[PDB]
Amino acid sequence: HKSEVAHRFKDLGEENFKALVLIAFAQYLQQCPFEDHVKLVNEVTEFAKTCVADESAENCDKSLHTLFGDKLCTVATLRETYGEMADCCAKQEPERNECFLQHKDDNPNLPRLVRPEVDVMCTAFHDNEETFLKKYLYEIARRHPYFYAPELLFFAKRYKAAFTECCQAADKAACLLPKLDELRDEGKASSAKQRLKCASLQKFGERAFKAWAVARLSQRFPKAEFAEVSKLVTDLTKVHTECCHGDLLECADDRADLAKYICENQDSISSKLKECCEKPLLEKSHCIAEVENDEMPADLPSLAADFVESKDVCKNYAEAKDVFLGMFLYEYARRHPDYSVVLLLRLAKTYETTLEKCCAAADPHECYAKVFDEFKPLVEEPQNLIKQNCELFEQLGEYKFQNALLVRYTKKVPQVSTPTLVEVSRNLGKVGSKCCKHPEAKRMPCAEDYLSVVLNQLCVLHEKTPVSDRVTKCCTESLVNRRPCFSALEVDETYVPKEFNAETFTFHADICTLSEKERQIKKQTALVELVKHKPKATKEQLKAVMDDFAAFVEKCCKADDKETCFAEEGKKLVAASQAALG
Ligand SMILES: CCCCCCCCCCCCCC(=O)O
Ligand SMILES: CCCCCCCCCCCCCC(=O)O
Ligand SMILES: CCCCCCCCCCCCCC(=O)O
């Protein structure tokens, strides 16, 4: 239309438009205070209303990109505050937009957002919901300048719903703090998952990216024909490519274009899209990305005929290797929503390797007649890890499961930092409690999804402060080999026990006072150090010290003198332990 502002304003609606403009400037003027942004928003919003009344009104025909940069260049202190960013303004439009993109600061130096008291939060929420939510919306977005704006908005609406429900409850903190934790974790995960898409594309290329998409969409839309899955994969890959480049309007337009093609082609795609396809422009593409897997056709044969038994396997393969392999991924994927995408990819690569070797062999048909047998152990490996970890988790609770893991991994990579070991072991543990809750059918997809985040966070930390080549090996390997790489780590026999540190195994009565969280953390911190000082300590020995420590803590927490107790019982416990371990 003549006016991009007016058209966006109309299908977004005033409220969404204003939130979106606020997020958009916050991510670029990360050092301007909230009031300045509220001022920008009001000005852009007034102007937008001008174009809605009259598409022909002044400057209404300019692109949003132009209007956005004009506004940015309008900021008084732009130069004093942002230096080089101000130079973008000297450029003509196409170049200016690309220049602004380059000068977002990724890790802006602001203090951490501290969670205030439930009482002070609810009071603020009550006293002025808008400023309360928009200011925190501003704070978050200036700290996460690459977080997709509409996804940040979808989160903010969930925070809104949390306060609404909890600030008028009964035990506010009881209701609210668990929701805030969930929101925070979820949001951290979505951010890491977004950066992971772009980096994986960069490091591993379009072909790998598309392979991944074939598998996933095939599971999602098993009724769609390969041709339609492959059209979707091509467009999906284009979308991510544009989005990783980082221009928000272009990302949003590409995302919206894909959703409406999908919505216009439901019958060729999935029977599940009705609800998503009736949602407004803003939530449509997001609804589709999360839609339940559709039911598979039911009368599906067996891959043997097309992929093993058929003469023409090598002919069909040679004629279009990636298409053939992609048809193979397709057919296996739609039959197996129960697998993780990465396993499907292992199978595809195994099938590929076999064909490479077999179509150049004396007798191809005999050569690959048994390729399906090679899939068995690949499949069975994650399935057995699930059963073993989930059984253990059913014996031990979550927390004693986290302890099991902590003893497990400290022995494998005892060089890793204690905090990193505690953190990662606690995270792996949640993955357990969560995914083990599902029936067998949804466990691997579950594990894959959350393992990608935990394992990515681990490699991110380790890449910034390397410590074990092995850890670094698993982190840099293909995303398909990553979890198996970590799984294949064993006990570090190279390791020289950490020398005894008295203070490390000293406790005070404040432990009786910490929250449940920080008490676990301090116990688990000590548990790691225990395994670090005595690495060859046995499972039976370890429990004996753990039961003593537990008793120790209970005793000195109940005593008419806690502190004195922690000190004297404390020396007893330690000496007794230093002896129990040979
Ligand atoms: C002029 C200020 C720029 C404001 C940018 C807000 C527009 C964002 C629209 C996002 C629409 C979502 C599309 C989608 O993800 O499917
Ligand atoms: C982690 C999900 C956050 C939403 C993604 C933000 C940017 C979207 C670009 C690609 C959108 C297509 C998503 C997909 O269906 O794979
Ligand atoms: C050599 C001194 C050993 C005593 C200090 C080690 C304490 C280990 C902490 C055990 C924590 C397990 C969790 C729990 O007790 O519930």
Side-chain angles (χ1 to χ4, degrees), residues 1-38 40-45 47-79 81-101 103-105 108-118 120-167 169-194 196-201 203-237 239-241 243-273 276-277 279-289 291-298 300-310 312-314 316-356 358-364 367-369 371-379 381-386 389-399 401-436 438-441 443-463 465-478 480-498 500-502 504-516 518-521 523-533 535-538 540-546 548-553 556-559 561 563-567 569-570 572-577 579-582:
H1 174 57
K2 305 159 194 172
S3 189
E4 297 174 22
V5 232
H7 188 269
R8 299 224 187 241
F9 193 83
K10 280 180 196 166
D11 50 39
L12 258 10
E14 186 170 340
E15 300 301 325
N16 294 323
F17 185 85
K18 296 175 50 190
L20 292 163
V21 177
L22 178 61
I23 298 159
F25 288 100
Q27 306 189 303
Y28 282 90
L29 287 17
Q30 306 160 345
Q31 304 295 329
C32 294
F34 181 62
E35 294 77 17
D36 291 0
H37 286 87
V38 164
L40 284 170
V41 176
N42 303 342
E43 293 171 351
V44 168
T45 293
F47 169 65
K49 277 170 41 224
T50 282
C51 310
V52 169
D54 194 341
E55 356 151 344
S56 266
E58 264 292 65
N59 294 213
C60 285
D61 58 340
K62 301 188 175 183
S63 67
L64 273 178
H65 285 103
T66 292
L67 294 163
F68 187 86
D70 286 5
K71 245 311 180 299
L72 237 46
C73 293
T74 244
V75 181
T77 46
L78 190 72
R79 174 149 243 121
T81 307
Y82 306 98
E84 287 159 74
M85 171 179 319
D87 299 323
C88 296
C89 297
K91 291 171 163 56
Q92 290 284 246
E93 191 31 57
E95 281 81 90
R96 194 174 62 170
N97 188 67
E98 190 69 24
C99 180
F100 282 124
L101 257 36
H103 308 286
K104 287 164 86 155
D105 203 56
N109 290 119
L110 296 168
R112 75 173 178 80
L113 227 29
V114 341
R115 185 190 290 196
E117 295 307 311
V118 166
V120 330
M121 289 182 100
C122 290
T123 301
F125 177 81
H126 163 82
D127 278 359
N128 192 338
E129 320 212 329
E130 253 226 79
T131 75
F132 169 89
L133 304 163
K134 301 289 188 86
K135 209 174 222 271
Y136 272 92
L137 186 50
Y138 152 81
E139 296 289 353
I140 310 280
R142 71 204 289 238
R143 279 158 177 94
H144 305 83
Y146 299 108
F147 198 111
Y148 190 52
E151 171 114 333
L152 213 333
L153 175 51
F154 141 98
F155 271 97
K157 283 164 186 185
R158 301 174 60 211
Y159 279 99
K160 184 164 186 161
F163 292 99
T164 289
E165 175 183 350
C166 290
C167 288
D171 200 0
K172 307 179 188 184
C175 177
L176 176 55
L177 266 12
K179 300 180 188 315
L180 296 173
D181 288 355
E182 168 175 34
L183 260 3
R184 181 200 57 212
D185 288 348
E186 184 142 10
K188 280 192 262 195
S190 169
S191 156
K193 196 170 298 187
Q194 289 165 242
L196 195 55
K197 289 290 171 55
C198 301
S200 298
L201 179 81
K203 309 164 166 171
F204 302 120
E206 268 204 14
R207 183 179 177 259
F209 204 90
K210 283 176 163 194
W212 193 97
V214 169
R216 194 55 190 99
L217 293 168
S218 289
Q219 294 175 304
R220 218 151 183 77
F221 309 136
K223 297 174 168 162
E225 307 193 349
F226 170 77
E228 187 74 33
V229 164
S230 133
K231 206 277 179 181
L232 288 177
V233 165
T234 304
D235 298 356
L236 219 208
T237 291
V239 180
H240 276 281
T241 299
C243 295
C244 293
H245 187 252
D247 183 306
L248 168 60
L249 290 202
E250 303 293 329
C251 186
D253 289 357
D254 281 1
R255 280 178 58 103
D257 289 354
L258 187 41
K260 65 176 294 293
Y261 169 91
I262 287 166
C263 283
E264 262 157 36
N265 288 288
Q266 301 188 48
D267 290 359
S268 297
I269 300 169
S270 162
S271 78
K272 302 277 193 172
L273 295 161
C276 285
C277 287
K279 287 179 179 297
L281 187 144
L282 177 60
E283 312 166 15
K284 194 175 284 181
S285 75
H286 175 80
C287 188
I288 296 169
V291 66
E292 191 188 58
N293 289 337
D294 195 11
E295 284 208 279
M296 64 177 99
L300 302 188
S302 155
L303 278 70
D306 290 346
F307 300 104
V308 183
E309 280 149 28
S310 166
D312 302 355
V313 156
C314 288
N316 285 189
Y317 173 59
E319 180 157 0
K321 293 181 175 190
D322 289 5
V323 173
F324 200 67
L325 295 172
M327 288 174 168
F328 170 93
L329 221 208
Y330 161 81
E331 300 282 11
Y332 220 111
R334 66 193 182 130
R335 289 182 211 215
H336 294 268
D338 59 323
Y339 296 175
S340 67
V341 177
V342 49
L343 160 72
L344 275 160
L345 289 172
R346 293 178 196 118
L347 301 173
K349 182 57 266 185
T350 304
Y351 186 70
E352 173 177 40
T353 303
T354 291
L355 292 197
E356 281 296 304
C358 286
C359 301
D363 186 339
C367 190
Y368 54 63
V371 71
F372 280 9
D373 290 358
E374 306 211 342
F375 296 149
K376 175 181 149 187
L378 257 15
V379 173
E381 187 276 312
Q383 297 182 312
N384 297 331
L385 274 203
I386 287 285
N389 280 291
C390 286
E391 287 176 27
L392 184 57
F393 168 96
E394 281 150 8
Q395 286 186 311
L396 317 174
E398 173 173 290
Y399 172 83
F401 174 59
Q402 288 169 337
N403 285 5
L405 291 175
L406 221 35
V407 171
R408 180 144 92 210
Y409 305 128
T410 313
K411 269 142 62 177
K412 303 211 171 190
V413 290
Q415 296 88 1
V416 182
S417 196
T418 291
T420 291
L421 271 166
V422 162
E423 224 230 332
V424 169
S425 288
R426 316 186 79 254
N427 287 341
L428 269 356
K430 302 201 257 173
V431 181
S433 73
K434 183 161 197 63
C435 301
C436 297
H438 299 269
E440 185 179 318
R443 281 180 178 177
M444 210 180 319
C446 184
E448 171 179 34
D449 184 5
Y450 300 107
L451 255 2
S452 52
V453 327
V454 182
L455 250 27
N456 171 55
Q457 170 218 3
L458 159 61
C459 294
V460 160
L461 310 192
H462 187 270
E463 98 88 1
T465 316
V467 139
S468 177
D469 52 290
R470 287 139 77 229
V471 176
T472 279
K473 159 94 168 307
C474 300
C475 297
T476 45
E477 204 130 45
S478 26
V480 161
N481 288 348
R482 171 173 292 199
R483 189 287 299 168
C485 183
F486 277 113
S487 278
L489 294 173
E490 260 157 339
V491 176
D492 197 315
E493 306 291 13
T494 236
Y495 193 60
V496 186
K498 206 217 190 65
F500 196 81
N501 196 292
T504 294
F505 306 109
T506 306
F507 312 80
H508 303 90
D510 61 345
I511 71 112
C512 308
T513 266
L514 298 180
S515 53
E516 233 317 302
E518 294 304 339
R519 185 187 298 113
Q520 302 181 6
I521 300 201
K523 277 137 82 191
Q524 290 174 324
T525 293
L527 179 48
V528 179
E529 301 289 346
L530 177 44
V531 180
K532 282 203 191 164
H533 163 45
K536 304 300 279 279
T538 228
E540 318 295 56
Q541 297 180 303
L542 253 38
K543 170 127 201 190
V545 176
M546 267 169 275
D548 287 351
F549 172 94
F552 158 72
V553 160
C556 295
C557 268
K558 281 210 53 209
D561 181 334
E563 185 177 316
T564 272
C565 180
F566 272 92
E569 304 277 27
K572 286 193 73 176
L573 163 85
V574 153
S577 297
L581 315 178

